Every structure is written in structure tokens, then in C-alpha cells.
Amino acid sequence: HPVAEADYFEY
Amino acid sequence: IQRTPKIQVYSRHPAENGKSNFLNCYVSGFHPSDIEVDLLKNGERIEKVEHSDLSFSKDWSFYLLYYTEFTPTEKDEYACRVNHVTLSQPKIVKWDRDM
């Protein structure tokens, strides 16, 4: 199962 | 900077004439990921070739397996033709059953 990113995740 | 593809052409199982098998072209070590690959039979592009999903190695270079069902014979010639941004011209690698 992949990791869930937090909202507005960006480099 | 860019990395040119390594290319191997080979069969899924040991080749025996008249027995159905799979012809593989494995391209690896390349970057960026766009690449064109065709399998050839006596110089002509084979139509319904499948391939694996795009993935990459620990060094970030991409690899793909192209394959199709085929029945080896004594006289039919098989090869893999590859183009990539790093190549001025398509590279042709012939199938050699001892490789």
C-alpha cells in the first residue's frame, strides 16, 4: 500500500 | 545528461525449431524514458508486441521488456530495433540463440 501524501504536498 | 539503452534480444525458453516460444527484447540503463522498440521478423516489424510497465533501477535508469509469441525456425531471422534520443540512428540487434 502506498504512502498517502498530506494535502498540498509539493517539492 | 542522457544515458543510451543497453539492448538484449533472446527467448523466454531455450529455442527449438517448430516449438512456440516468446521473443524478448530487454532495453535497460536508459534515460530519459521515451524509447521506441520494435521486434523484426526477416526485417519486417512484428505487429502485436506487448511490453512491461515503465520502471527503473536503483541508479534511476529505466528498463522495459518487449515480447511477442513466436515459433523459431532454421531460416527465419529475428531482431530488435531501438531508437532513443541518444541514438543518431536506430540500433539493430539480431537474435542469436546462443546469447
Binding site: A6, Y11 | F56
Partner: protein, 276 residues
């Protein structure tokens, strides 16, 4: 033995040819089990191994949601990195990411990974402490700062020590007949004269899983590293892998050469010679 799970993300810009493509694939060891491709007619997470098919609708929906959201943020991230490197809008660029967990032979966490690259070069990586980052350059330092500000590392650590291991263990059990089966190489040595005075010995390994293998030639018991031609391990297309190693030897000296094979699937290692 030891096992790992990895997800591989590739986000590729393509100016003039639509919005950047996002692809994600998931692996346990050398076995892919899921894919998602934003270019698909109907983008959704799809199964690529039989043992994953038993997961319920909520699993697939949740995966697809994650990858759909990532499709959008990775497009913004590509924009961001273009700017960090003062690049024009004309070029195609790629962000790659690979992350996941390694288990030891007892099933406990060995270590976690979360590494990213830009145009094929190291960009930023989570350190083995799962607490700090290594940035490749001043552009990546900008990402580091944002990630430090948003407590990303802490979140990665929680996933890597928790859900990552838990799911990996579940997949290993569900797919135990394959994922926990090592298939040993089938081996043989071939002989081809290259002249009157020299011949090629090729040592073959076929039908093995997983891909990890060691194939070496020795002459008089001495490793022939520099003189051995060694092809990259290659997929057969049926889950198994293939490899060979070749050496050119003086005619008449063939019996001085031995091929040695190490593979997880081997009760004991092999020593092979050409059998005329």
C-alpha cells in the same frame, strides 16, 4: 529470507503534448503487483499480480485516490523544479521517486527509503535515521526546507515503520507460494571456438527467482573478473530471470576453468565445467 516493498513514481513533463504523465508501480522484491498510469483511458490502480486481486474495493479506491492526487501535485512539483534550475518551458523533465521498506529474515524492519531524483540525478533522499534529509544541490535544499517546515520526515517514518511493514507482511503471506519461493537457476556451459587457438566458454543460468545471483569464472581457482564478459540479469517474462558469463580461453586449457554459481535457491552452490 529477506524481503522488500518499493513504489516507483515517474512524473514526466512534455511541453506541447499535454500535461505531465504520472506513473506509479509497486513491487515486492522482483515481483510487480500494481500499476497506475495517468495516461490510461480510465486512470485507476490496477492489479499486476494474482495475490493482490483479493484486496477489496476500498483498497483500490484508496490507491487510486492517492495516485490521482499525486498526478496533480507532481505536475506542480515539476513546475517548481523547473524554476529552481532556471530552466525554460521548452524542455521535458522528469522527477522520479522510489520509497519503501526492507525486512530482514525474521520479518522485522531493517531500514526504510524515500529517495527522489530530477532528470536522472540524485535530488533529495531521506537519511537512514528517517529523520533528516540529504539534498544534492542548492535547488534540492529548497525542497529540504519546505519538507522540514512541513514535518515530512516524521510522516515518512511513521509510514515506513508502520503501514509499509504491515502491508509488506500481508502481501508476503497472501503470495507466499511465489513470493517466498526461491527458484534455483538451471545451469549449463557451452563451448564455441573463436579461432584455431581460442574458444569461448559460456556459463548459463536460466529460470531463477529472485534476480539476485552470482556468476563467476575461475582459472586454476583464481577469479577471472577482468576477462569475464557478464551480461545484465534479464527477465524471461514468466517471473524468472536469466544471466550468462563468458570467458575466452586457450584451446586445450578448458578444464582449467570453472564456473561458480551462487543463488538463494541453491541448496548448495554450484561449480560447473564444460562437459565435452
Amino acid at each position: 529470507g529477506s524481503h522488500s516493498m518499493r513504489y516507483f513514481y515517474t512524473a514526466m513533463s512534455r511541453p506541447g503534448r499535454g500535461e505531465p504523465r504520472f506513473i506509479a508501480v509497486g513491487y515486492v522484491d522482483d515481483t510487480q503487483f500494481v500499476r497506475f498510469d495517468s495516461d490510461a483511458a480510465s486512470p485507476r490502480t490496477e492489479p499486476r499480480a494474482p495475490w493482490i486481486e483479493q484486496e477489496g474495493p476500498e483498497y483500490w479506491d484508496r490507491n487510486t485516490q492517492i495516485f490521482k492526487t499525486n498526478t496533480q501535485t507532481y505536475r506542480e512539483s515539476l513546475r517548481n523544479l523547473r524554476g529552481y534550475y532556471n530552466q525554460s518551458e521548452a524542455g521535458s523533465h522528469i522527477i522520479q521517486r522510489m520509497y519503501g521498506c526492507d525486512l530482514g529474515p525474521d520479518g522485522r524492519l531493517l531500514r526504510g527509503h524515500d529517495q527522489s531524483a530530477y532528470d536522472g540525478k540524485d535530488y533529495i533522499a531521506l537519511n537512514e535515521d528517517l529523520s533528516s534529509w540529504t539534498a544534492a544541490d542548492t535547488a534540492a535544499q529548497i525542497t529540504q526546507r519546505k519538507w522540514e517546515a512541513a514535518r515530512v520526515a516524521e510522516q515518512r517514518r511513521a509510514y515506513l515503520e508502520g503501514l509499509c511493514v504491515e502491508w509488506l507482511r500481508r502481501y508476503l503471506e497472501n503470495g507466499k507460494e511465489t513470493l517466498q519461493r526461491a527458484d534455483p537457476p538451471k545451469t549449463h556451459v557451452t563451448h564455441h571456438p573463436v579461432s584455431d587457438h581460442e574458444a569461448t566458454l559460456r556459463c548459463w543460468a536460466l529460470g531463477f527467482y529472485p534476480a539476485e545471483i552470482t556468476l563467476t569464472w575461475q582459472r586454476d581457482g583464481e577469479d577471472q573478473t577482468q576477462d569475464t564478459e557478464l551480461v545484465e540479469t534479464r527477465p524471461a517474462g514468466d517471473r524468472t530471470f536469466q544471466k550468462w558469463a563468458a570467458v575466452v580461453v586457450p584451446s586445450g586449457e578448458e578444464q582449467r576453468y570453472t564456473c561458480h554459481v551462487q543463488h538463494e535457491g541453491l541448496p548448495k552452490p554450484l561449480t560447473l565445467r564444460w562437459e565435452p
